[PDB]
Amino acid sequence: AYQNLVGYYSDDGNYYCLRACVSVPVSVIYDKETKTHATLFGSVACEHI
Amino acid sequence: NLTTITKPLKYSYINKCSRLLSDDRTEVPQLVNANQYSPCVSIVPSTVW
Amino acid sequence: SGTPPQVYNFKRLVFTNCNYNLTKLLSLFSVNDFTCSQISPAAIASNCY
Amino acid sequence: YNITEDEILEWFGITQTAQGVHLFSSRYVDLYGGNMFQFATLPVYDTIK
Amino acid sequence: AVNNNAQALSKLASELSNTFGAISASIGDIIQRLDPPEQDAQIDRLING
Ligand SMILES: *[C@@H]1O[C@H](CO)[C@@H](O[C@@H]2O[C@H](CO)[C@@H](O[C@@H]3O[C@H](CO[C@H]4O[C@H](CO)[C@@H](O)[C@H](O)[C@@H]4O)[C@@H](O)[C@H](O[C@H]4O[C@H](CO)[C@@H](O)[C@H](O)[C@@H]4O)[C@@H]3O)[C@H](O)[C@H]2NC(C)=O)[C@H](O)[C@H]1NC(C)=O
Ligand SMILES: *[C@@H]1O[C@H](CO)[C@@H](O[C@@H]2O[C@H](CO)[C@@H](O)[C@H](O)[C@H]2NC(C)=O)[C@H](O)[C@H]1NC(C)=O
Ligand SMILES: *[C@@H]1O[C@H](CO)[C@@H](O)[C@H](O)[C@H]1NC(C)=O
Known part of the structure; x- marks a missing residue:
């Protein structure tokens, strides 16, 4: 309904889906007056290095 | 170095084109x-x- | 080939499901003027329709 | 156009765009049923009234 | 309330499809299919929207 190509019929007769090139959004945690910070990758297992 | 193509007689266009109704008193531009x-x-x- | 007809008698060539190559087509043209509205002049060379 | 013979109700469709005349049939795709899919493009010179 | 949250998210997920007066909803297609000086104006319009 949102005018996006959900899938495709290829020339071999094999149908395929395409969704997105999803990449992990990142948040940062930081503490004032102790100059320390760390990074969080949400909704993803520890797979992206 | 291209003579195989031909050329027309002269350039020409339509400067006035109109429709005249049945009454022959009201003019409709096209x-x-x-x-x-x-x-x-x-x-x-x-x-x- | 043929004779280029008048401006009010223009000949239209339509292309669907074929291959074009302006590299072998625009080279043989002595183009006086090259304007492209709502589109770039290089878009017709590369992008597919 | 070669089509098969049957006793099934079908649909025939005539329309036009600036591309030319577009002719539609239901036999090519939804022969077991009734839809309307594109099967012919006609290089007309002018729109039909 | 659940549908309210869902439609609030669908507001964000839907308005990317809207061109906001531009000619295409893909910025990469905009910068590929157009020359820089007018694609700047088109991008500026869609950024404003
Ligand atoms: C005039 O009379 C003739 C015959 O008396 C009718 O022709 C038959 O029409 C029916 C109705 O469409 C056809 O039935 C269709 O069968 C399909 C499956 O058949 C395949 O597999 C069998 C073997 O199992 C083969 O023999 C056959 O050739 C096919 O390869 C179904 O898939 C069709 O269902 C589809 O359409 C219906 C709606 O109609 C949907 O609900 C389904 O979901 C699906 O999309 C369909 O049921 C039958 O094949 C025809 N036979 C012949 C010999 O032509 C005419 O229809 C009838 N005309 C009128 C106007 O009444
Ligand atoms: C379309 O057909 C009509 C019908 O013949 C043509 O009209 C004739 O035009 C000639 C001039 O070329 C006149 O001398 C005749 O009197 C016209 N006859 C009628 C019945 O109108 C018309 O020229 C044709 N147009 C094209 C583009 O072929
Ligand atoms: C269509 O019918 C004509 C007339 O008999 C025949 O010459 C032609 O080979 C047919 N084409 C196909 C694809 O059946």
């Missing part, structure tokens, strides 16, 4: 639409002499 043909194409020959 408008050509996007990628269409005027009614005056049906009345003007291939070349204007």
Whole structure:
């Protein structure tokens, strides 16, 4: 309904889906007056290095 | 270095084209639409002499 | 080939499901003027339709 | 156009765009049923009234 | 309330499809299919929207 190509019929007769090139959004945690910070990758297992 | 193509007699265009009604007293100017043909194409020959 | 007809008698060539190459086509043209509205002049060379 | 023979109700469709005349049939795709899919393009010179 | 949250998210997920007066909803297609000086204006319009 949102005018996006959900899938495709290829020339071999094999149908395929395409969704997105999803990449992990990142948040940062930081503490004032102790100059320390760390990074969080949400909704993803520890797979992206 | 290209002579195989031919050339027409002369350039020509339609400076005035109109429709006259049955009363022969009211004049309708013509408008050509996007990628269409005027009614005056049906009345003007291939070349204007 | 042929004779280029008049401006009010223009010949239209339509292309669907084939291959074009303006590299072998625009080179043989002595183009006086090259304007492209709502589109770049290089878009017709590369982008597919 | 070669089509098969049957006793099934079908649909025939005539329309036009600036591309030319577009002719539609239901036999090519939804022969077991009734839809309307594109099967012919016609290089007309002008729109039909 | 659940549908309210869902439609609030669908507001964000839907308005990317809207061109906001531009000619295409893909910025990469905009910068590929157009020359820089007018694609700057088109991008500026869609950024404003
Ligand atoms: C005039 O009379 C003739 C015959 O008396 C009718 O012709 C038959 O019409 C029916 C109705 O469409 C056809 O039935 C269709 O069968 C399909 C499956 O058949 C395949 O597999 C069998 C073997 O199992 C083969 O023999 C056959 O050739 C096919 O390869 C179904 O898939 C069709 O269902 C589809 O359409 C219906 C709606 O109609 C949907 O609900 C389904 O979901 C699906 O999309 C369909 O049921 C039958 O094949 C025809 N036979 C012949 C010999 O032509 C005419 O229809 C009838 N005309 C009128 C106007 O009444
Ligand atoms: C379309 O057909 C009509 C019908 O013949 C043509 O009209 C004739 O045009 C000639 C001039 O070329 C006149 O001398 C005749 O009197 C016209 N006859 C009628 C019945 O109108 C018309 O020229 C044709 N147009 C094209 C573009 O072929
Ligand atoms: C269509 O019918 C004509 C007439 O008999 C025949 O010459 C032609 O080979 C047919 N084409 C196909 C694809 O059946």
